[PDB]
mmCIF file of N, CA and C in Angstrom:
data_model
loop_
_atom_site.group_PDB
_atom_site.id
_atom_site.type_symbol
_atom_site.label_atom_id
_atom_site.label_comp_id
_atom_site.label_asym_id
_atom_site.label_seq_id
_atom_site.Cartn_x
_atom_site.Cartn_y
_atom_site.Cartn_z
ATOM 1 N N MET A 65 -21.362 103.020 94.342
ATOM 2 C CA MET A 65 -20.502 102.726 95.527
ATOM 3 C C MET A 65 -19.441 101.681 95.179
ATOM 4 N N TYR A 66 -18.281 101.801 95.818
ATOM 5 C CA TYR A 66 -17.129 100.964 95.532
ATOM 6 C C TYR A 66 -16.563 100.401 96.828
ATOM 7 N N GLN A 67 -15.748 99.361 96.681
ATOM 8 C CA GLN A 67 -15.090 98.700 97.800
ATOM 9 C C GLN A 67 -13.593 98.642 97.531
ATOM 10 N N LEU A 68 -12.798 98.854 98.579
ATOM 11 C CA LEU A 68 -11.349 98.829 98.472
ATOM 12 C C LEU A 68 -10.857 97.462 98.925
ATOM 13 N N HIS A 69 -10.127 96.778 98.052
ATOM 14 C CA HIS A 69 -9.465 95.520 98.385
ATOM 15 C C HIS A 69 -8.001 95.819 98.680
ATOM 16 N N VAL A 70 -7.546 95.516 99.895
ATOM 17 C CA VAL A 70 -6.188 95.826 100.289
ATOM 18 C C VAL A 70 -5.594 94.555 100.856
ATOM 19 N N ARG A 71 -4.527 94.069 100.242
ATOM 20 C CA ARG A 71 -3.752 92.974 100.807
ATOM 21 C C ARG A 71 -2.517 93.575 101.464
ATOM 22 N N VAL A 72 -2.410 93.408 102.776
ATOM 23 C CA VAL A 72 -1.214 93.800 103.509
ATOM 24 C C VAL A 72 -0.270 92.610 103.380
ATOM 25 N N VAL A 73 0.705 92.723 102.477
ATOM 26 C CA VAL A 73 1.495 91.558 102.086
ATOM 27 C C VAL A 73 2.633 91.330 103.066
ATOM 28 N N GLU A 74 3.507 92.321 103.191
ATOM 29 C CA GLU A 74 4.749 92.128 103.933
ATOM 30 C C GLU A 74 5.389 93.485 104.160
ATOM 31 N N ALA A 75 6.399 93.505 105.029
ATOM 32 C CA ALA A 75 7.187 94.709 105.230
ATOM 33 C C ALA A 75 8.648 94.316 105.365
ATOM 34 N N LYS A 76 9.520 95.308 105.201
ATOM 35 C CA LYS A 76 10.949 95.090 105.349
ATOM 36 C C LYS A 76 11.616 96.370 105.821
ATOM 37 N N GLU A 77 12.879 96.219 106.229
ATOM 38 C CA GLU A 77 13.715 97.324 106.701
ATOM 39 C C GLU A 77 13.078 98.042 107.884
ATOM 40 N N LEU A 78 12.423 97.273 108.746
ATOM 41 C CA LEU A 78 11.851 97.832 109.959
ATOM 42 C C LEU A 78 12.949 98.204 110.959
ATOM 43 N N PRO A 79 12.684 99.166 111.827
ATOM 44 C CA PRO A 79 13.658 99.512 112.866
ATOM 45 C C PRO A 79 13.682 98.490 113.995
ATOM 46 N N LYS A 80 14.810 98.456 114.694
ATOM 47 C CA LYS A 80 14.877 97.717 115.944
ATOM 48 C C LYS A 80 14.044 98.442 117.000
ATOM 49 N N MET A 81 13.017 97.766 117.528
ATOM 50 C CA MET A 81 12.139 98.330 118.549
ATOM 51 C C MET A 81 12.330 97.692 119.921
ATOM 52 N N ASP A 82 13.156 96.651 120.026
ATOM 53 C CA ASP A 82 13.437 95.953 121.278
ATOM 54 C C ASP A 82 14.944 95.922 121.493
ATOM 55 N N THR A 83 15.375 96.059 122.754
ATOM 56 C CA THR A 83 16.806 96.089 123.046
ATOM 57 C C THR A 83 17.483 94.794 122.620
ATOM 58 N N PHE A 84 16.829 93.659 122.852
ATOM 59 C CA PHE A 84 17.395 92.354 122.532
ATOM 60 C C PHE A 84 16.567 91.594 121.500
ATOM 61 N N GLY A 85 15.622 92.250 120.854
ATOM 62 C CA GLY A 85 14.823 91.606 119.829
ATOM 63 C C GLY A 85 14.953 92.300 118.492
ATOM 64 N N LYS A 86 13.928 92.195 117.655
ATOM 65 C CA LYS A 86 13.989 92.932 116.405
ATOM 66 C C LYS A 86 12.837 93.909 116.315
ATOM 67 N N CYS A 87 11.673 93.411 115.897
ATOM 68 C CA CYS A 87 10.439 94.171 115.784
ATOM 69 C C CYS A 87 9.306 93.156 115.875
ATOM 70 N N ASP A 88 8.228 93.520 116.561
ATOM 71 C CA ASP A 88 7.043 92.669 116.666
ATOM 72 C C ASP A 88 5.931 93.468 116.008
ATOM 73 N N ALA A 89 5.895 93.449 114.685
ATOM 74 C CA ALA A 89 5.137 94.441 113.932
ATOM 75 C C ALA A 89 3.756 93.926 113.559
ATOM 76 N N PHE A 90 2.776 94.827 113.637
ATOM 77 C CA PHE A 90 1.460 94.652 113.041
ATOM 78 C C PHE A 90 1.072 95.961 112.350
ATOM 79 N N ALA A 91 0.117 95.859 111.432
ATOM 80 C CA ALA A 91 -0.341 96.998 110.658
ATOM 81 C C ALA A 91 -1.800 97.296 110.970
ATOM 82 N N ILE A 92 -2.147 98.579 110.889
ATOM 83 C CA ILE A 92 -3.510 99.051 111.065
ATOM 84 C C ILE A 92 -3.872 99.851 109.826
ATOM 85 N N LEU A 93 -5.059 99.595 109.289
ATOM 86 C CA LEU A 93 -5.591 100.301 108.137
ATOM 87 C C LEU A 93 -6.763 101.157 108.590
ATOM 88 N N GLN A 94 -6.719 102.447 108.269
ATOM 89 C CA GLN A 94 -7.822 103.347 108.560
ATOM 90 C C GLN A 94 -8.167 104.136 107.310
ATOM 91 N N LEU A 95 -9.440 104.126 106.933
ATOM 92 C CA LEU A 95 -9.922 104.943 105.828
ATOM 93 C C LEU A 95 -10.364 106.289 106.391
ATOM 94 N N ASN A 96 -9.844 107.373 105.815
ATOM 95 C CA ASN A 96 -10.087 108.742 106.308
ATOM 96 C C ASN A 96 -9.814 108.754 107.811
ATOM 97 N N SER A 97 -10.698 109.321 108.630
ATOM 98 C CA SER A 97 -10.635 109.238 110.086
ATOM 99 C C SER A 97 -11.786 108.382 110.610
ATOM 100 N N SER A 98 -12.111 107.330 109.867
ATOM 101 C CA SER A 98 -13.208 106.445 110.228
ATOM 102 C C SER A 98 -12.967 105.774 111.573
ATOM 103 N N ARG A 99 -14.047 105.610 112.342
ATOM 104 C CA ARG A 99 -13.975 104.851 113.584
ATOM 105 C C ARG A 99 -13.720 103.369 113.337
ATOM 106 N N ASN A 100 -14.004 102.879 112.134
ATOM 107 C CA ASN A 100 -13.805 101.476 111.793
ATOM 108 C C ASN A 100 -12.407 101.291 111.218
ATOM 109 N N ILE A 101 -11.606 100.451 111.872
ATOM 110 C CA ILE A 101 -10.231 100.202 111.472
ATOM 111 C C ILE A 101 -10.016 98.699 111.360
ATOM 112 N N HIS A 102 -8.954 98.335 110.651
ATOM 113 C CA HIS A 102 -8.608 96.946 110.408
ATOM 114 C C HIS A 102 -7.161 96.730 110.821
ATOM 115 N N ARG A 103 -6.868 95.537 111.321
ATOM 116 C CA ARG A 103 -5.590 95.241 111.950
ATOM 117 C C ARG A 103 -5.099 93.854 111.553
ATOM 118 N N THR A 104 -3.798 93.736 111.267
ATOM 119 C CA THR A 104 -3.184 92.438 111.016
ATOM 120 C C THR A 104 -2.798 91.766 112.328
ATOM 121 N N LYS A 105 -2.434 90.490 112.234
ATOM 122 C CA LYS A 105 -1.776 89.827 113.345
ATOM 123 C C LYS A 105 -0.377 90.394 113.532
ATOM 124 N N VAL A 106 0.173 90.187 114.749
ATOM 125 C CA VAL A 106 1.573 90.484 115.014
ATOM 126 C C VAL A 106 2.429 89.361 114.459
ATOM 127 N N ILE A 107 3.531 89.711 113.806
ATOM 128 C CA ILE A 107 4.583 88.743 113.502
ATOM 129 C C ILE A 107 5.744 89.045 114.441
ATOM 130 N N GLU A 108 6.063 88.094 115.305
ATOM 131 C CA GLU A 108 7.033 88.328 116.364
ATOM 132 C C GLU A 108 8.469 88.240 115.866
ATOM 133 N N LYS A 109 9.316 89.110 116.425
ATOM 134 C CA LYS A 109 10.778 89.029 116.347
ATOM 135 C C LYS A 109 11.279 88.840 114.915
ATOM 136 N N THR A 110 10.946 89.809 114.061
ATOM 137 C CA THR A 110 11.408 89.803 112.677
ATOM 138 C C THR A 110 11.504 91.234 112.169
ATOM 139 N N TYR A 111 12.402 91.455 111.202
ATOM 140 C CA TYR A 111 12.439 92.703 110.442
ATOM 141 C C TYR A 111 11.713 92.612 109.102
ATOM 142 N N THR A 112 11.265 91.416 108.721
ATOM 143 C CA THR A 112 10.668 91.153 107.405
ATOM 144 C C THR A 112 9.379 90.349 107.561
ATOM 145 N N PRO A 113 8.401 90.899 108.281
ATOM 146 C CA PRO A 113 7.140 90.183 108.491
ATOM 147 C C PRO A 113 6.389 89.988 107.189
ATOM 148 N N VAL A 114 5.724 88.845 107.089
ATOM 149 C CA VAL A 114 4.815 88.535 105.981
ATOM 150 C C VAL A 114 3.463 88.214 106.600
ATOM 151 N N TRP A 115 2.467 89.052 106.329
ATOM 152 C CA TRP A 115 1.115 88.817 106.807
ATOM 153 C C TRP A 115 0.211 88.231 105.730
ATOM 154 N N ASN A 116 0.352 88.720 104.504
ATOM 155 C CA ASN A 116 -0.435 88.263 103.362
ATOM 156 C C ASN A 116 -1.922 88.231 103.702
ATOM 157 N N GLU A 117 -2.407 89.310 104.310
ATOM 158 C CA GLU A 117 -3.795 89.376 104.734
ATOM 159 C C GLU A 117 -4.590 90.375 103.904
ATOM 160 N N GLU A 118 -5.725 89.906 103.397
ATOM 161 C CA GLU A 118 -6.629 90.678 102.560
ATOM 162 C C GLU A 118 -7.735 91.300 103.400
ATOM 163 N N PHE A 119 -8.060 92.563 103.089
ATOM 164 C CA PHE A 119 -9.100 93.319 103.770
ATOM 165 C C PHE A 119 -10.023 93.941 102.740
ATOM 166 N N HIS A 120 -11.300 94.066 103.101
ATOM 167 C CA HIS A 120 -12.306 94.755 102.294
ATOM 168 C C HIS A 120 -12.814 95.958 103.078
ATOM 169 N N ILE A 121 -12.731 97.140 102.469
ATOM 170 C CA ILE A 121 -13.054 98.391 103.136
ATOM 171 C C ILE A 121 -14.038 99.159 102.265
ATOM 172 N N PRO A 122 -15.265 99.408 102.718
ATOM 173 C CA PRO A 122 -16.167 100.257 101.933
ATOM 174 C C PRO A 122 -15.602 101.661 101.751
ATOM 175 N N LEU A 123 -15.725 102.174 100.531
ATOM 176 C CA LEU A 123 -15.248 103.504 100.181
ATOM 177 C C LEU A 123 -16.415 104.486 100.138
ATOM 178 N N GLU A 124 -16.135 105.732 100.531
ATOM 179 C CA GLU A 124 -17.097 106.826 100.451
ATOM 180 C C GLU A 124 -16.931 107.667 99.192
ATOM 181 N N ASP A 125 -15.700 107.850 98.716
ATOM 182 C CA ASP A 125 -15.437 108.710 97.561
ATOM 183 C C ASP A 125 -14.085 108.299 96.989
ATOM 184 N N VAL A 126 -14.087 107.702 95.792
ATOM 185 C CA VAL A 126 -12.868 107.144 95.213
ATOM 186 C C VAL A 126 -11.817 108.188 94.873
ATOM 187 N N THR A 127 -12.162 109.474 94.917
ATOM 188 C CA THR A 127 -11.216 110.534 94.592
ATOM 189 C C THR A 127 -10.576 111.177 95.814
ATOM 190 N N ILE A 128 -11.333 111.388 96.883
ATOM 191 C CA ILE A 128 -10.835 112.160 98.011
ATOM 192 C C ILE A 128 -10.555 111.291 99.222
ATOM 193 N N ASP A 129 -10.986 110.027 99.214
ATOM 194 C CA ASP A 129 -10.700 109.127 100.325
ATOM 195 C C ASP A 129 -9.198 108.926 100.467
ATOM 196 N N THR A 130 -8.764 108.660 101.692
ATOM 197 C CA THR A 130 -7.369 108.360 101.981
ATOM 198 C C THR A 130 -7.314 107.070 102.787
ATOM 199 N N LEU A 131 -6.315 106.247 102.512
ATOM 200 C CA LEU A 131 -6.017 105.085 103.347
ATOM 201 C C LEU A 131 -4.754 105.400 104.132
ATOM 202 N N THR A 132 -4.862 105.423 105.454
ATOM 203 C CA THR A 132 -3.698 105.580 106.316
ATOM 204 C C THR A 132 -3.300 104.200 106.799
ATOM 205 N N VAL A 133 -2.040 103.858 106.599
ATOM 206 C CA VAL A 133 -1.498 102.571 107.023
ATOM 207 C C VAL A 133 -0.526 102.875 108.141
ATOM 208 N N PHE A 134 -0.813 102.324 109.320
ATOM 209 C CA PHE A 134 0.033 102.475 110.490
ATOM 210 C C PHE A 134 0.827 101.194 110.708
ATOM 211 N N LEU A 135 2.083 101.336 111.078
ATOM 212 C CA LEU A 135 2.895 100.220 111.561
ATOM 213 C C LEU A 135 3.144 100.440 113.043
ATOM 214 N N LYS A 136 2.915 99.404 113.850
ATOM 215 C CA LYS A 136 3.063 99.515 115.294
ATOM 216 C C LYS A 136 3.827 98.309 115.807
ATOM 217 N N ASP A 137 4.436 98.484 116.978
ATOM 218 C CA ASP A 137 5.211 97.436 117.626
ATOM 219 C C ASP A 137 4.423 96.900 118.808
ATOM 220 N N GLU A 138 4.372 95.577 118.940
ATOM 221 C CA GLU A 138 3.687 94.968 120.071
ATOM 222 C C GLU A 138 4.660 94.927 121.242
ATOM 223 N N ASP A 139 4.530 95.880 122.147
ATOM 224 C CA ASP A 139 5.414 95.908 123.296
ATOM 225 C C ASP A 139 4.872 95.006 124.400
ATOM 226 N N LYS A 140 5.697 94.798 125.428
ATOM 227 C CA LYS A 140 5.415 93.742 126.395
ATOM 228 C C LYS A 140 4.534 94.184 127.554
ATOM 229 N N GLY A 141 4.328 95.479 127.730
ATOM 230 C CA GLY A 141 3.414 95.990 128.720
ATOM 231 C C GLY A 141 2.030 96.227 128.174
ATOM 232 N N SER A 142 1.347 97.198 128.764
ATOM 233 C CA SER A 142 -0.055 97.476 128.487
ATOM 234 C C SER A 142 -0.278 98.254 127.197
ATOM 235 N N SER A 143 0.782 98.679 126.517
ATOM 236 C CA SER A 143 0.620 99.514 125.329
ATOM 237 C C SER A 143 1.537 99.050 124.211
ATOM 238 N N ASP A 144 1.203 99.505 122.997
ATOM 239 C CA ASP A 144 1.995 99.280 121.800
ATOM 240 C C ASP A 144 2.563 100.597 121.294
ATOM 241 N N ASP A 145 3.826 100.570 120.884
ATOM 242 C CA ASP A 145 4.513 101.779 120.453
ATOM 243 C C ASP A 145 4.290 102.012 118.963
ATOM 244 N N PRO A 146 4.050 103.239 118.534
ATOM 245 C CA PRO A 146 3.995 103.507 117.098
ATOM 246 C C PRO A 146 5.366 103.386 116.453
ATOM 247 N N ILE A 147 5.373 102.904 115.203
ATOM 248 C CA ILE A 147 6.577 102.880 114.373
ATOM 249 C C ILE A 147 6.516 103.960 113.301
ATOM 250 N N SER A 148 5.503 103.915 112.450
ATOM 251 C CA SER A 148 5.494 104.776 111.277
ATOM 252 C C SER A 148 4.110 104.729 110.656
ATOM 253 N N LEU A 149 3.883 105.601 109.677
ATOM 254 C CA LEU A 149 2.625 105.570 108.959
ATOM 255 C C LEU A 149 2.824 106.167 107.574
ATOM 256 N N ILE A 150 1.876 105.890 106.698
ATOM 257 C CA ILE A 150 1.825 106.551 105.400
ATOM 258 C C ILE A 150 0.372 106.820 105.059
ATOM 259 N N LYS A 151 0.131 107.954 104.420
ATOM 260 C CA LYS A 151 -1.205 108.374 104.005
ATOM 261 C C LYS A 151 -1.274 108.267 102.489
ATOM 262 N N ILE A 152 -2.101 107.345 102.008
ATOM 263 C CA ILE A 152 -2.177 106.952 100.606
ATOM 264 C C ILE A 152 -3.456 107.525 99.997
ATOM 265 N N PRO A 153 -3.369 108.503 99.095
ATOM 266 C CA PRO A 153 -4.577 108.972 98.397
ATOM 267 C C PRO A 153 -5.178 107.878 97.529
ATOM 268 N N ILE A 154 -6.488 107.673 97.674
ATOM 269 C CA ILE A 154 -7.131 106.639 96.878
ATOM 270 C C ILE A 154 -7.267 107.066 95.411
ATOM 271 N N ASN A 155 -7.172 108.361 95.108
ATOM 272 C CA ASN A 155 -7.333 108.791 93.719
ATOM 273 C C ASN A 155 -6.199 108.308 92.822
ATOM 274 N N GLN A 156 -5.103 107.803 93.399
ATOM 275 C CA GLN A 156 -3.976 107.321 92.611
ATOM 276 C C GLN A 156 -4.227 105.943 92.011
ATOM 277 N N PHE A 157 -5.328 105.275 92.382
ATOM 278 C CA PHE A 157 -5.640 103.947 91.876
ATOM 279 C C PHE A 157 -6.713 104.018 90.803
ATOM 280 N N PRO A 158 -6.394 103.714 89.547
ATOM 281 C CA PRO A 158 -7.444 103.654 88.519
ATOM 282 C C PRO A 158 -8.431 102.534 88.813
ATOM 283 N N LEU A 159 -9.696 102.788 88.496
ATOM 284 C CA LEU A 159 -10.755 101.863 88.875
ATOM 285 C C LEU A 159 -10.511 100.494 88.259
ATOM 286 N N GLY A 160 -10.671 99.453 89.078
ATOM 287 C CA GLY A 160 -10.564 98.086 88.632
ATOM 288 C C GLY A 160 -9.160 97.527 88.564
ATOM 289 N N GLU A 161 -8.138 98.372 88.434
ATOM 290 C CA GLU A 161 -6.782 97.886 88.219
ATOM 291 C C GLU A 161 -6.164 97.414 89.529
ATOM 292 N N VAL A 162 -5.376 96.344 89.445
ATOM 293 C CA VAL A 162 -4.637 95.819 90.596
ATOM 294 C C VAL A 162 -3.260 96.460 90.607
ATOM 295 N N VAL A 163 -2.903 97.066 91.736
ATOM 296 C CA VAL A 163 -1.629 97.750 91.892
ATOM 297 C C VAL A 163 -0.911 97.116 93.075
ATOM 298 N N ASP A 164 0.259 96.528 92.809
ATOM 299 C CA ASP A 164 1.094 95.829 93.794
ATOM 300 C C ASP A 164 2.378 96.636 93.924
ATOM 301 N N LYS A 165 2.573 97.270 95.078
ATOM 302 C CA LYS A 165 3.626 98.267 95.203
ATOM 303 C C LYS A 165 4.151 98.322 96.628
ATOM 304 N N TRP A 166 5.420 98.705 96.755
ATOM 305 C CA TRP A 166 6.015 99.049 98.038
ATOM 306 C C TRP A 166 5.835 100.530 98.355
ATOM 307 N N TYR A 167 5.627 100.821 99.636
ATOM 308 C CA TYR A 167 5.382 102.168 100.127
ATOM 309 C C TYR A 167 6.360 102.462 101.256
ATOM 310 N N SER A 168 7.008 103.625 101.199
ATOM 311 C CA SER A 168 7.913 104.043 102.266
ATOM 312 C C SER A 168 7.103 104.708 103.374
ATOM 313 N N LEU A 169 7.204 104.175 104.587
ATOM 314 C CA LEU A 169 6.493 104.733 105.726
ATOM 315 C C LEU A 169 7.325 105.830 106.372
ATOM 316 N N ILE A 170 6.638 106.779 106.985
ATOM 317 C CA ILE A 170 7.285 107.921 107.628
ATOM 318 C C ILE A 170 7.404 107.618 109.112
ATOM 319 N N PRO A 171 8.616 107.500 109.664
ATOM 320 C CA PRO A 171 8.754 107.145 111.079
ATOM 321 C C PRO A 171 8.270 108.249 111.997
ATOM 322 N N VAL A 172 7.826 107.847 113.187
ATOM 323 C CA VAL A 172 7.465 108.802 114.225
ATOM 324 C C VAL A 172 8.728 109.326 114.892
ATOM 325 N N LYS A 173 8.572 110.368 115.699
ATOM 326 C CA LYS A 173 9.710 110.983 116.366
ATOM 327 C C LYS A 173 10.389 109.969 117.271
ATOM 328 N N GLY A 174 11.709 109.884 117.163
ATOM 329 C CA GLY A 174 12.478 108.953 117.955
ATOM 330 C C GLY A 174 12.659 107.584 117.345
ATOM 331 N N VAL A 175 12.036 107.317 116.203
ATOM 332 C CA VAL A 175 12.212 106.073 115.460
ATOM 333 C C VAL A 175 13.031 106.405 114.221
ATOM 334 N N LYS A 176 14.150 105.706 114.035
ATOM 335 C CA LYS A 176 15.129 106.185 113.064
ATOM 336 C C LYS A 176 14.729 105.885 111.625
ATOM 337 N N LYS A 177 14.068 104.758 111.369
ATOM 338 C CA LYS A 177 13.597 104.437 110.028
ATOM 339 C C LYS A 177 12.187 103.877 110.108
ATOM 340 N N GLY A 178 11.398 104.157 109.078
ATOM 341 C CA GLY A 178 9.997 103.801 109.109
ATOM 342 C C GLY A 178 9.665 102.456 108.499
ATOM 343 N N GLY A 179 10.592 101.886 107.729
ATOM 344 C CA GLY A 179 10.322 100.674 106.983
ATOM 345 C C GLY A 179 9.590 100.919 105.669
ATOM 346 N N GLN A 180 9.410 99.831 104.934
ATOM 347 C CA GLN A 180 8.639 99.771 103.700
ATOM 348 C C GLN A 180 7.596 98.675 103.847
ATOM 349 N N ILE A 181 6.397 98.895 103.307
ATOM 350 C CA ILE A 181 5.302 97.939 103.390
ATOM 351 C C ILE A 181 4.755 97.720 101.982
ATOM 352 N N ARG A 182 4.489 96.461 101.655
ATOM 353 C CA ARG A 182 4.021 96.062 100.343
ATOM 354 C C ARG A 182 2.526 95.824 100.432
ATOM 355 N N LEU A 183 1.777 96.548 99.617
ATOM 356 C CA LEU A 183 0.327 96.473 99.595
ATOM 357 C C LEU A 183 -0.115 96.213 98.165
ATOM 358 N N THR A 184 -1.078 95.319 98.005
ATOM 359 C CA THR A 184 -1.746 95.087 96.728
ATOM 360 C C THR A 184 -3.167 95.611 96.859
ATOM 361 N N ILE A 185 -3.540 96.557 95.994
ATOM 362 C CA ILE A 185 -4.756 97.334 96.165
ATOM 363 C C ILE A 185 -5.495 97.345 94.842
ATOM 364 N N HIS A 186 -6.804 97.164 94.897
ATOM 365 C CA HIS A 186 -7.613 97.465 93.723
ATOM 366 C C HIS A 186 -8.969 97.964 94.188
ATOM 367 N N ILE A 187 -9.552 98.858 93.395
ATOM 368 C CA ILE A 187 -10.883 99.384 93.645
ATOM 369 C C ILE A 187 -11.857 98.578 92.807
ATOM 370 N N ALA A 188 -12.900 98.059 93.442
ATOM 371 C CA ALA A 188 -13.859 97.215 92.746
ATOM 372 C C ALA A 188 -15.277 97.685 93.021
ATOM 373 N N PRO A 189 -16.182 97.542 92.052
ATOM 374 C CA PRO A 189 -17.598 97.810 92.333
ATOM 375 C C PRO A 189 -18.126 96.885 93.422
ATOM 376 N N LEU A 190 -19.006 97.422 94.261
ATOM 377 C CA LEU A 190 -19.540 96.666 95.389
ATOM 378 C C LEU A 190 -20.445 95.517 94.930
#
């Protein structure tokens, strides 16, 4: 069994999600379609949030598992609007190696750009 170490470092080139603001972005990490998800804090009113938050996620299968990274906007009412997401195959990470990379997110319908998110990932024995 293995564990996924994911640092949600920062994002840039986010879309404007507020008429008079910028973006109030947070990230959500989901492995496969697991009920267990992980979430960053919101960074208010910025296009270049830095969270620098590390997460540990138990893995089921280092070859077929997927990490979905969602970017969402903290809106002012009862709900948060989706921004974008990317689905990252875990098989692209060689065991033990640290990979620090930017990822282009795919925007949802009606959002003009998805942004880029920087993640540092390594697979480690439990």
